[PDB]
Design a protein around this ligand. Structure first.
Ligand SMILES: O=c1ccn([C@@H]2O[C@H](COP(=O)(O)CP(=O)(O)O)[C@@H](O)[C@H]2O)c(=O)[nH]1
Length: 542
């Protein structure tokens, strides 16, 4: 059992199982034992079986904390959202002081739009980051009202834990001579944000920057998307799913990558330990983790003048590089299809449709309140949202009612295949952004379909992304100072269709004319920046 933990700790789940099972062989029905078995299952990804057992073991010892949290982990990944929440609750009841349970609880509550004791929970996670302690996940922490400084703190602490338990590969340099090898590590190469944002760029680079060798290190297998196949077509895609961290790192070294981009990085399925092994001489943070890595192994972050302005530099560990337009490319080959009718989409046939298709953890009391206030001031408006996990949708219905709006004014879109979800935007009149974690991919999606995005650019990179897209498009009037200006601008537009029509017209002009959706230009800018970076590190060219 002690043995079994070490065996499980090591990775040998089968030997782990064998040990545990002999443990149970002694006292059948025992909490401490029954739980480890369920943890084997969880590790083995037999997630429904993990939860049966941890429920047996939880029920026999309603008081171990310990076991409660582990049952949460298992119920989370088994898609039993509300029950996983109820388990983290208990684990928090038993140990209110442990800023490792609180962090997992808070995050799971944001994702279910459960806001009980939110501020008290957030404070305790922020306290934990200020001493950290250290538990706290930098991705989850993005959802909090913390400053750039606090996110950095959270990220270092997490980075230090990794850098301590890893020995870097032998240092190497950028080749002085020959075509530059450029590498990108992601689990999202396919029908995922990363694949979706980068695909038209890679095809543009393949055509326009022949002196750069693109390499994609995919930490996920083929999902059968046209994205994965296009990405494969436009580069050398290496499937490294199932290689451990070190073998992944060695495989990047084997290919002699000069510049290596981390697309995810604190992400969730991200392999930051691969970066921690420094397989490439220059390592860049870009695009799909909207914050600092906080990490000694990351040389650079790639941003832009708006989303990462001079006043944000003190709060990055990386050195800051900027593109000449927005940091964010997108799939400009996408023909947005026509949606079903409004009725077929749950929408009324008349009425202004305000929408926000953001992830549930981005929808907080502040972002919701201000969307709801727009609805109160605009008679026949409707609010169109992504349907969310567990009972998320019902909690927002109750909150709308509490905020003095008819709950039936909220329409919840089920998750759709990307081409179908994209088409939904043609029914939307205005996209209402979230704070402090902006719409990112979803804002690019919205604008590409022709739907304007209203945002309140904040003080962190993650609260400035929507506003960068507006800024680089020329839509400055859609970046407003605060909640009051937000509700006012939206109300102004929603209650005057002629101005609204003019705005859609304006977005169409600016869509075609600005550099924002010009992936050829993006490729030339990106490539030139890569080349100039490489010469700064001794590349002589060719
Ligand atoms: O019904 C849907 C809903 C969402 N998306 C896609 O879900 C993704 C946005 O999800 P994220 O919040 O994890 C990524 P971000 O925070 O970096 O912006 C995009 O790929 C959307 O096109 C769909 O394709 N269909």
């Amino acid at each position: 059992l002690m043995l079994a933990d070490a065996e499980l700790g090591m990775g040998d789940t089968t030997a782990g199982e064998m040990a545990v099972q002999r443990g149970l062989a002694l006292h059948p029905g025992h909490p401490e034992a029954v739980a480890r078995l369920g943890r084997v299952r969880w590790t083995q990804q037999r997630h429904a079986e993990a939860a049966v057992l941890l429920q047996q073991a939880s029920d026999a010892a309603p008081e171990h904390p310990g076991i409660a949290l582990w049952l949460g982990h298992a119920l989370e990944d088994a898609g039993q959202a509300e029950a996983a929440a109820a388990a983290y609750t208990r684990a928090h009841q038993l140990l209110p002081e442990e800023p490792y349970i609180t962090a997992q609880l808070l995050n799971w509550r944001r994702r279910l739009c459960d806001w009980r004791a939110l501020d008290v929970l957030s404070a305790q996670v922020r306290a934990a980051v200020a001493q950290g302690v250290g538990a706290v996940e930098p991705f989850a922490f993005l959802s909090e009202d913390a400053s750039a400084a606090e996110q950095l703190a959270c990220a270092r602490t997490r980075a230090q834990a990794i850098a301590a338990s890893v020995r870097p590969l032998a240092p190497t340099r950028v080749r002085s001579k020959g075509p530059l090898r450029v590498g990108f590590v992601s689990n999202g190469f396919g029908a995922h944000p990363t694949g979706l944002l980068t695909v038209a760029l890679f095809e543009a680079l393949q055509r326009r920057q022949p002196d750069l060798q693109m390499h994609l290190f995919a930490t996920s297998g083929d999902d059968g998307s046209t994205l994965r196949t296009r990405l494969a077509q436009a580069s050398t895609l290496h499937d490294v799913t199932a290689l451990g961290h070190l073998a992944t790192a060695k495989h990047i070294r084997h290919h002699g990558i000069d510049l290596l981009f981390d697309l995810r990085g604190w992400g969730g399925g991200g392999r930051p330990e691969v970066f921690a092994l420094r397989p490439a001489p220059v390592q860049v943070n870009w695009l799909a983790y909207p914050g600092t890595s906080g990490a000694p192994w990351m040389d650079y972050v790639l941003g832009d003048a708006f989303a990462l302005p001079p006043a944000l530099e003190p709060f990055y560990s990386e050195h800051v590089l900027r593109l000449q337009g927005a940091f964010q490319p997108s799939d400009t080959s996408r023909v947005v299809a026509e949606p079903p009718s409004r009725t077929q989409c749950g929408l009324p046939e008349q009425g202004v449709v305000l929408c926000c298709f953001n992830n549930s953890y981005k929808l907080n009391p502040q972002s919701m309140a201000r969307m709801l206030a727009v609805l109160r001031e605009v008679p026949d408006s409707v609010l169109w949202l992504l349907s969310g996990p567990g009972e998320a949708d019902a909690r927002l219905r109750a909150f709308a009612h509490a905020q003095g709006v008819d709950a039936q004014r909220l329409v919840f879109m089920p998750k759709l295949p990307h081409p179908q979800y994209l088409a939904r935007y043609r029914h939307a009149d205005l996209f209402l952004d979230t704070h402090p974690y902006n719409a990112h991919t979803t804002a690019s999606d919205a604008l590409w379909t022709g739907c304007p995005v209203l945002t309140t650019p904040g003080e962190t990179f993650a609260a400035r992304v929507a506003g960068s897209l507006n800024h680089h498009l020329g839509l400055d009037e859609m970046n407003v100072a605060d909640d009051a200006a937000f509700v006012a601008k939206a109300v102004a537009l929603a209650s005057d269709p002629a101005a609204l029509t003019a705005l859609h017209a304006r977005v169409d002009v600016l869509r075609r004319a600005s550099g924002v959706f010009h992936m050829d230009g993006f490729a030339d800018d990106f490539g030139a920046l890569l080349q100039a970076l490489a010469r700064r590190h001794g590349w002589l060219g060719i």
